[PDB]
Amino acid sequence: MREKWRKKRMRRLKRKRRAAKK
Amino acid sequence: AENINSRLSMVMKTGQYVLGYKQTLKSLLNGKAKLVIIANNTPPLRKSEIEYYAMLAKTGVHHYNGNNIELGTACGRLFRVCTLAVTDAGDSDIIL
Amino acid sequence: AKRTKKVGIVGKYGTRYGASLRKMAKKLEVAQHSRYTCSFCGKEAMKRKATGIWNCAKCHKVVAGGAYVYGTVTAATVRSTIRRLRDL
Amino acid sequence: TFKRRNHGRNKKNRGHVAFIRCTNCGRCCPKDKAIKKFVVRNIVEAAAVRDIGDASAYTQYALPKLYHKLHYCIACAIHSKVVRNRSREARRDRNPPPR
Amino acid sequence: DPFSRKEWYDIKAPNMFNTRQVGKTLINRTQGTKIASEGLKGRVFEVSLGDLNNSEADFRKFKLIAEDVQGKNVLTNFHAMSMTHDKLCSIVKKWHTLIEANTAVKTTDGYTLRVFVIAFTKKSVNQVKKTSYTKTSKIRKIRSEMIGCIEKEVTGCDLKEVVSKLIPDSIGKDIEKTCSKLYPLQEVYIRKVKIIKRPKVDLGRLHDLH
Amino acid sequence: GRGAPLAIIAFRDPYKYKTVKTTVVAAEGMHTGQFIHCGAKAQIQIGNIVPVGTLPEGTTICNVENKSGDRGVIARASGNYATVIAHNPDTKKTRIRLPSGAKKVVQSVNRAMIGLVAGGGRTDKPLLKAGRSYHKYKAKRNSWPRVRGVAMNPVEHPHGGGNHQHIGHPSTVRRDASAGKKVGLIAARRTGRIRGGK
Amino acid sequence: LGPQAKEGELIFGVAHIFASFNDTFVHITDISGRETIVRVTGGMKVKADRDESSPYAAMLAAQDVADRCKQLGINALHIKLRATGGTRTKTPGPGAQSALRALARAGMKIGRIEDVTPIPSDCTRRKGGRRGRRL
RNA sequence: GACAUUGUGAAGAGUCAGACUCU
RNA sequence: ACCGGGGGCAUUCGUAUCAUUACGCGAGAGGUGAAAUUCGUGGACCGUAGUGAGACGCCCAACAGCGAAAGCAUUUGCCAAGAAUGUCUUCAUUAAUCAAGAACGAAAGUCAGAGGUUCGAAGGCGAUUAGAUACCGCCCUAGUUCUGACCGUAAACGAUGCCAUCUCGCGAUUCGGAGGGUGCCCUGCCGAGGAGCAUCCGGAAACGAAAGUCUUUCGGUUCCGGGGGUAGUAUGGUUGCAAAG
């Protein structure tokens, strides 16, 4: 539960980047 | 079940047979039909007619455990056989 | 040559009604326009005449089946249950 | 560092083992890993067997027993002291302790 | 006092059991449309074979269902049988294979009884091997043999005879002596018996039973 | 106008030299040239019409008779069926499960056809076009297209009118409302999306 | 009030002793079990909720029930021990032994004692999560 | 809801003194 | 009289949970470290007997078995498949590993249709706390179950690729065989597994009968690593309904 939350954070950031680029 | 398929294959390889309703009737009438194999999906009237001919000719009727597609496949043909008559068992023990 | 990559028979609808609706209709359209093996004559000649009615081109038998399929899973299960009860 | 040769379980020749719910905490633990104990005890405590016998309505009545197969997960087992931590050498000892 | 309305009745077990006196029940005295006899008809009482026949087989329990009331006597009949949880728990052992079977068998009287049988593999006399397992095919064969033996024993007789055979558990010993040809069985009991289908109550037959 | 195919079946008149033709919704699997046996002594076969008292629990039936002699009134839509839940010989009754999930008690002599109604799965293909719905209702009755009440004027609908298209009053109306007012969710026990089983 | 005793016959009720870790029931019925002579729970005898299951509460309830049974003429009790069972703990609570010993001391004869905790052939999912109760 | 259409029998309770009322 | 929780389809049974019916009881029940939210005289909780739904197959159950792995456990019926063992049966190099390519692939998740018992993300309350968007308790929605499709990822672990061969001792264990004695026992019995403790050598060590037979390096073959982050991120490509791979 330390790097898994980093993965979750990065996934949220990637989702936001996808929404912005779209 | 599994034995009848092997006996039928042996009959086809070595024996003599006629595939089809009309040839089966002719063979039954002229009395050279040792056995008559009949598919399970054959029309009921045709089934009764074949059985009556067999009873008249004193020959055995075997109700194959399959439809005409499977009977043709057992005979080794790429078409459908709904009735056949073996007239010479050849090197097989199909009659017994 | 394969004319359509994925749309298939539903290509008659062009770009209308939505991708998901067209996909949902594709399965049933293919099923209702396909040919089925007739359990009586054994030939692949069962074709839908109207919703629920299927005609065999060879033996001329008319069967009551599904709306878009020759037979339905529920009907198959009911037939199996009746056969099992008959056997035992 | 690998603490145990068996990796804390009893799983050999096996891919997956169904789990059990710990008697105390309720946590899911693999059956091989969970610590099991078979407890057979008198239905009445040793301090009241005599009272029940003297109050018995029969000349000779055999007092029944309670049989319980308890499964504990590692945490609750250690907390309840069903098992204890052992020295590095004593860890390999597999014989059950004297009762 | 709310207990002033209760009348006390005596439960009467049928004649398969030596001790025909079971115990004392109670019910509100008849009032308006509520009849004590009709309220009692349908009750179930759990008794021990230790309290019925005084045999060493105390662990066996019998359920008796009240079908008729005469005076202050509630005449009961067999309703179900089950072993005791303590006996079953003591029976279950590790390193031994447990064989369980159950079958629905029909009496000549119109009852269908579901009988549940339990058995265990036995250690031989001179056995060093700790475990007492066996091949699962042998387990299947033993289960089939147990089912067939139960069928042969029960079918052909009626409720009275089956209850008489259950009282000493003759079926258990017959199993332990016959099915042992494959793997010597130990501690075979008729774990339970329940009534699936029963005929309409026959008061004449119940009276003969009482 | 009907999604289930009809079966024309010919029977022999027992009392005169004549044949009688019957029209009934076909059960799936029924075919031309088949023999259908109707009566108390008919066996358990698809298409047979028998009293519900002779069927085992869990049997699937259609064309169930609500009352003995009404000639089949229940489970007649395509792909629908009822199930035989339970029997009671003492009262000579049977409990059955209807397509809507309701449970209903009928006399054991009520007749039903063994099997389910043919043409099932009809309402899985979308009617992608409005013309499809037009043709659908052209063969049934005048019930289409459907105009929203909020789109009307207050003279024709309780929901009509307003500078915004809004109902203005609760859509749930009581059972005993008058003829011109009973519009919306009539005697609704609840509203909103169903979360859970119901 | 009560049945007729044939000069020393043991009149038997059945005492269901449901001893959970939160409360204890001692509940007396007839052999059929469909009629209740008397029942008392630890919560009826103690005030604080923390000690509804205490041995003191169990023994007080047992004494009251024994008094009532002796009043009504019941002199023997078939015991039916019970825990929460089901998916919960199978071990009887701390009030079971106190209630049993209290009845024995009050003077009721003790018949057959049996444990009737409900045991499943297999269960629905237990209460806590897959990580259990973390406290 | 009441009255009339509305008839023929049982069981329980309550009123009375064989009737009424109810369920 | 093969062996096996290997797979699939039907089917039988089991208590338990919940709901509910009938009867009795009489004021608490539930829950906690303590409480409260909550349920309860409309008579709950508790008893005895039923009824209905869905889920799950306790105990037996193991350093036991099967499967390529993921995984697999109530009875019975049917279908196809398979290991080891036995073989003085047959073919005769047909083999090992494998870019690209393909099947399967826990749980969660997505789509559609049935089911909705239990539990239960999210949500809402009662607690605890300085706060408590948590741990604890109560009520629960998606989900958890089945059918038909998607995704293709797990500490998918033995953190050890596969094939062949050599190097030690002991006694146990599953299956089959051989020889004796009476299902069990015996044969320092033979193979095939799955392990354990006496262990050459190896290793930074922990430790490993392989992680040994390697500066005395060299049996065949596939994949992968090159100080720590940036970062499995940006961009491009591709698959996917989406999540994302």
JSON list of N, CA, C and O in Angstrom, two decimals, chain B residues 15 17 22 27 29 37 39 59 69 92:
[
{"chain": "B", "resi": 15, "resn": "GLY", "atom": "N", "xyz": [-16.60, -55.75, -48.19]},
{"chain": "B", "resi": 15, "resn": "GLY", "atom": "CA", "xyz": [-17.88, -56.33, -48.51]},
{"chain": "B", "resi": 15, "resn": "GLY", "atom": "C", "xyz": [-18.55, -55.65, -49.69]},
{"chain": "B", "resi": 15, "resn": "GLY", "atom": "O", "xyz": [-17.98, -54.79, -50.37]},
{"chain": "B", "resi": 17, "resn": "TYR", "atom": "N", "xyz": [-22.32, -53.76, -50.85]},
{"chain": "B", "resi": 17, "resn": "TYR", "atom": "CA", "xyz": [-23.42, -53.03, -50.22]},
{"chain": "B", "resi": 17, "resn": "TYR", "atom": "C", "xyz": [-24.10, -52.16, -51.26]},
{"chain": "B", "resi": 17, "resn": "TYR", "atom": "O", "xyz": [-23.58, -51.92, -52.35]},
{"chain": "B", "resi": 22, "resn": "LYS", "atom": "N", "xyz": [-33.96, -46.81, -52.66]},
{"chain": "B", "resi": 22, "resn": "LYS", "atom": "CA", "xyz": [-34.43, -47.55, -53.83]},
{"chain": "B", "resi": 22, "resn": "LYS", "atom": "C", "xyz": [-33.63, -48.83, -54.03]},
{"chain": "B", "resi": 22, "resn": "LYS", "atom": "O", "xyz": [-34.19, -49.91, -54.25]},
{"chain": "B", "resi": 27, "resn": "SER", "atom": "N", "xyz": [-32.83, -54.71, -53.55]},
{"chain": "B", "resi": 27, "resn": "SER", "atom": "CA", "xyz": [-32.06, -55.81, -52.98]},
{"chain": "B", "resi": 27, "resn": "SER", "atom": "C", "xyz": [-32.92, -56.68, -52.09]},
{"chain": "B", "resi": 27, "resn": "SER", "atom": "O", "xyz": [-32.79, -57.91, -52.09]},
{"chain": "B", "resi": 29, "resn": "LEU", "atom": "N", "xyz": [-36.18, -57.10, -52.44]},
{"chain": "B", "resi": 29, "resn": "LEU", "atom": "CA", "xyz": [-37.10, -57.84, -53.31]},
{"chain": "B", "resi": 29, "resn": "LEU", "atom": "C", "xyz": [-36.41, -59.02, -53.97]},
{"chain": "B", "resi": 29, "resn": "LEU", "atom": "O", "xyz": [-36.98, -60.12, -54.04]},
{"chain": "B", "resi": 37, "resn": "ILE", "atom": "N", "xyz": [-29.34, -51.72, -42.65]},
{"chain": "B", "resi": 37, "resn": "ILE", "atom": "CA", "xyz": [-29.06, -50.72, -41.63]},
{"chain": "B", "resi": 37, "resn": "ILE", "atom": "C", "xyz": [-29.83, -49.46, -41.98]},
{"chain": "B", "resi": 37, "resn": "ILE", "atom": "O", "xyz": [-29.83, -49.02, -43.13]},
{"chain": "B", "resi": 39, "resn": "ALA", "atom": "N", "xyz": [-31.13, -45.48, -40.61]},
{"chain": "B", "resi": 39, "resn": "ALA", "atom": "CA", "xyz": [-30.82, -44.36, -39.72]},
{"chain": "B", "resi": 39, "resn": "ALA", "atom": "C", "xyz": [-32.00, -44.05, -38.81]},
{"chain": "B", "resi": 39, "resn": "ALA", "atom": "O", "xyz": [-33.15, -44.42, -39.07]},
{"chain": "B", "resi": 59, "resn": "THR", "atom": "N", "xyz": [-34.84, -61.03, -43.16]},
{"chain": "B", "resi": 59, "resn": "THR", "atom": "CA", "xyz": [-33.53, -60.41, -43.00]},
{"chain": "B", "resi": 59, "resn": "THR", "atom": "C", "xyz": [-33.55, -59.45, -41.83]},
{"chain": "B", "resi": 59, "resn": "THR", "atom": "O", "xyz": [-34.60, -58.93, -41.45]},
{"chain": "B", "resi": 69, "resn": "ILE", "atom": "N", "xyz": [-26.81, -38.20, -41.51]},
{"chain": "B", "resi": 69, "resn": "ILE", "atom": "CA", "xyz": [-25.48, -37.60, -41.63]},
{"chain": "B", "resi": 69, "resn": "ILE", "atom": "C", "xyz": [-24.44, -38.53, -41.01]},
{"chain": "B", "resi": 69, "resn": "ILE", "atom": "O", "xyz": [-23.41, -38.84, -41.62]},
{"chain": "B", "resi": 92, "resn": "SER", "atom": "N", "xyz": [-15.82, -59.33, -42.76]},
{"chain": "B", "resi": 92, "resn": "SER", "atom": "CA", "xyz": [-16.34, -58.77, -41.52]},
{"chain": "B", "resi": 92, "resn": "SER", "atom": "C", "xyz": [-17.38, -59.71, -40.93]},
{"chain": "B", "resi": 92, "resn": "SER", "atom": "O", "xyz": [-17.93, -60.58, -41.62]}
]
